[PDB]
DNA sequence: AGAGGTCAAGGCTAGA
DNA sequence: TCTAGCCTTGACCTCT
């Protein structure tokens, strides 16, 4: 019963290097494959939870990379 | 093809085959708890260029054809599978 | 397992 | 106001 290193949601195994949920797995895949560049509309310190992760793409991706998700896979 | 207005369907939405218009209309009608009223004989015809002439008959047609109110999520989370 | 793919949920905001 | 075309998302799915 392990948790996503990004948002704390239930994790389903390792994805792109680190334990994570299906949401952050899918989010990271789409951000890298499509070369998306996000920007925080606030203070670059947005909360990452199941209910609030979708409210800032920039901080979500930043967390993904900081926690160790490997872009090289794609 | 949309079961409500005949417009081209984009897939299943809230239970039945429907277009993006009726998809969004049903979502807005349920989430905002809208009550509409018909200004005629509660029998307005539903087509692409006419569905927007009576919100009451459009919503009644949505429910008749099987659009499910329970398909709007209380937690408001997107994606996944039902 | 852990990649990539599926496709109906909800989100955004032009255009009427 | 409201509409709907298009985008973003994620629990399952197939594939390597
Ligand atoms: Zn996560
Ligand atoms: Zn942020
Ligand atoms: Zn329709
Ligand atoms: Zn009517």
Q: Which residues of B touch A51 (CB under 8 A)?
A: 75, 77
Name the structure determination technique. Answer: X-ray
Name the nearest CA neighbour of B14 among B51, A5, B6, B3.
Answer: B3
How many Å does it take to go from CA B57 to C1' D12? 36
* Chain-centre distance for alpha carbon A58: 9
Nearest to B16 by CA among B35, B31, B1: B1
Resolution attained, angstroms: 2.1
C-alpha dist (Å) from residue A43 to A17, A56, A60, B34: 27, 10, 13, 37
Nearest partner of B25 among B59, B54, B2, judged by Cα:
B59
Non-local CB neighbours of B26 within 8 Å, separated by 6+ positions:
B13, B14, B18, B59, B62, B67
Strand pairing class (A14-15; B11-13): unpaired
Nearest residue to nucleotide D12, by CA–C1' distance, is B81
DSSP E strands, B14-76: 16-18
**Domains of chain A, first to last:** 1-74 (3.30.50.10)
CA of B11 to C1' of C10 (A): 16
Q: Nucleic chain D: which protein residues 10-69 of B have CB below 7 A from it?
A: 19-22, 24-25, 28, 48, 51-52, 55, 58
| Alpha carbon of residue B45 to chain centroid | 14
CA angle B79, B34, B65 (to 5 degrees): 65
Query: How far is A28 from B50, CA to CA, in rounded Å?
Result: 42
């Amino acid at each position: 019963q392990r948790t996503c290193l990004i948002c704390g949601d239930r994790a389903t195994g390792l994805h792109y290097g680190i334990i994570s949920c299906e949401g952050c797995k899918g989010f990271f895949k789409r951000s890298i494959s499509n070369k998306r560049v996000y920007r925080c509309s606030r203070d670059k310190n947005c909360v990452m939870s199941r209910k609030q992760r979708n409210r800032c793409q920039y901080c979500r991706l930043l967390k993904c990379l900081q926690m160790g998700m490997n872009r090289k896979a794609i």
